[PDB]
């Protein structure tokens, strides 16, 4: 008790320093940033808030623990007030309440007592200006607490938080409208909680009402004030509207637009993965293979850990349907290894034309396939493997007989061997000629690709894309 | 051993000598483009470090 009793005082000063300077310096800094300039945005604290909360999402959030009483939530939420520079005294009052935790008996004002606290910024008379600071006071205390996931009786409190956070949406659309630029700051802030809107429902049930609320918020941002707002809502769309039926595949056609400009970076790279699984069930391989490969190289930076790793696993699903793939252990990670072991030997059975090995993989690894939901391909991937084998033989041989290719690919019958090549020319797999007597397959080499003609036609798209990057460089150089 | 440049024909039994050794467009280009990758990779240390 004496040793553990003296170790309690030191830690809470640590959140009283760095966590104190998190929302007070950024919020107090964004104060003058949102009063003017306000170019663009920028508002560099908006992306700085991303460097904080995401760091808070690991440690310490608001809590912890930390051997405090979790009185940081009621601390900053009261006495905003606010006014002219005397608000600096409110930060001084926030320091005076720090000593209350370390001197008197500390009590927990969170949970049941947070309902009157969320109404305080409106009851302080008044905010009077920045909703995001109240939105932050309605999020940074409450939203990092959701990662506890106790699920008992506080889920409705997370719903009551979104109720007053929807009252902030009432002040979001109605208030300002004159050179606002605070919605663009909220478009990053309101996205997070809107992702938490899904997280709160996903632990109970799918949201039927918020889907209608999504289309209401989706169209109301167009065209009046939209920056990154419709794109973040489009992420909420394709996320749940994919996993849940139905018709939402073709729904993307009327939403695009694009929506330009893609913001920000990897946000649209994983979006290309979301619409990539769409095109994966659409069976179009050409557009699906380019959107998945682009999603890998355009997604920074990790670690950690399996977020980018597990999302890359299902990303090569379109590559398993291409018919030309190498072994996937080059994308393997030691942390993702044990998880992809059923998915590892999978593509090993794709590289082989063996029917016994392909069926044994589905039978043994079917337990892992149930959590993936990938069974759509396993029925038609047999035809993809036989195209990998026939392309391997046709590229390695000029003439290939139907009797020799029968047992080597264990087709066992001449009739279906003719049915494979008949629809191979329909699919453009091979130019192999067939002379019908018994019959046999006598083909000839394909040529005339050469150098001059076709490779120079591709160079037209190569350089026209290169000079577009010149335009991308001119646009980027002109911002500073 | 490069001492003899030519190719034979087994069917009709004719040894045909043909050569076009010099290419100044491909070799002087591709070698520099591979070197151009080394110029960017060495600059990737400047790029990533100055940003973060």
């Amino acid at each position: 008790p004496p040793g553990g009793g003296e170790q309690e005082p030191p830690p809470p000063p640590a959140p009283q320093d760095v966590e104190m300077k998190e929302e007070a310096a950024t919020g107090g800094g964004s104060t003058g940033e949102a009063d003017g300039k306000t170019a663009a945005a920028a508002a560099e604290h908006s992306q700085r808030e991303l460097d904080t909360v995401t760091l808070e999402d690991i440690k310490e959030h608001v809590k912890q623990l930390e051997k405090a009483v979790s009185g940081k939530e009621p601390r900053f939420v009261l006495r905003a007030l606010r006014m002219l520079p005397s608000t600096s005294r409110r930060l001084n009052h926030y320091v005076l309440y720090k000593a209350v935790q370390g001197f008197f008996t500390s009590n927990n004002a969170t949970r049941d007592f947070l309902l009157p606290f969320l109404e305080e910024p409106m009851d302080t008379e008044a905010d009077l200006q920045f909703r995001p600071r109240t939105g932050k006071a309605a999020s940074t205390p409450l939203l990092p607490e959701v990662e506890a996931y106790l699920q008992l009786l506080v889920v409705i409190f997370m719903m009551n938080s979104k109720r007053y956070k929807e009252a902030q949406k009432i002040s979001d659309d109605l208030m300002q409208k004159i050179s606002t630029q605070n919605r663009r700051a909220l478009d990053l802030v309101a996205a997070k909680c809107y992702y938490y809107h899904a997280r709160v429902y996903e632990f109970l049930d799918k949201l039927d009402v918020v889907r209608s609320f999504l289309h209401a918020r989706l169209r109301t941002a167009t065209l009046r004030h939209d920056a990154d707002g419709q794109a973040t809502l489009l992420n909420l769309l394709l996320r749940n509207y994919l996993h849940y039926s139905l018709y939402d595949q073709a729904e993307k056609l009327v939403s695009k637009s694009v929506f330009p400009e893609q913001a920000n970076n990897n946000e649209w790279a994983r979006y290309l993965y979301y619409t990539g699984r769409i095109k994966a069930i659409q069976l179009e391989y050409s557009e699906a293979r380019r959107t998945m490969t682009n999603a890998l190289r355009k997604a920074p930076q990790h670690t950690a850990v399996g977020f980018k790793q597990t999302v890359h696993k299902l990303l090569i699903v379109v590559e398993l349907l291409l018919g030309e793939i190498p072994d996937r252990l080059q994308f393997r990670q030691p942390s993702l290894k044990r998880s992809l072991m059923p998915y590892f030997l999978l593509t090993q059975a794709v590289r082989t034309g063996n029917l016994a090995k392909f069926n044994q993989v589905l039978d043994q690894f079917g337990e892992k396939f149930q959590a993936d939901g990938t069974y759509t391909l396993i029925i038609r991937l047999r035809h993809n493997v036989i195209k990998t084998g026939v392309r391997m033989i046709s590229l390695s041989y000029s003439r290939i007989s139907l009797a020799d290719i029968a047992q080597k690919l264990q087709l066992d019958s001449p009739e279906d061997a003719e049915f494979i090549v008949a629809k191979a020319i329909r699919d453009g797999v091979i130019e192999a000629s067939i002379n019908h007597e018994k019959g046999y397959v006598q083909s000839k080499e394909m040529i005339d690709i050469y150098s001059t003609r076709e490779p120079q036609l591709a160079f037209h798209q190569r350089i026209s894309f290169c000079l577009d990057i010149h335009n991308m460089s001119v646009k980027a150089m002109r911002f500073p | 051993d490069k001492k003899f440049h030519g190719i034979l024909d087994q069917g009709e039994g004719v040894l045909i000598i043909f050569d076009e050794p010099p290419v100044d467009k491909t070799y002087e280009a591709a070698l520099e483009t591979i070197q151009n990758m080394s110029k960017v990779v060495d600059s990737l240390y400047n790029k990533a470090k100055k940003l973060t």
Partner: peptide, 30 residues
């Protein structure tokens, strides 16, 4: 061929050196 080959290297001279020199002055000014 001389078009596409050289323009790709000219782009490598235009794109790289610009982003370097621009990232230098931009972020170190403020």
């Amino acid at each position: 061929y001389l078009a596409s080959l050289i323009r790709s290297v000219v782009a490598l001279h235009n794109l790289i050196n610009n982003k370097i020199a621009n990232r230098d002055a931009e972020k170190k000014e403020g």
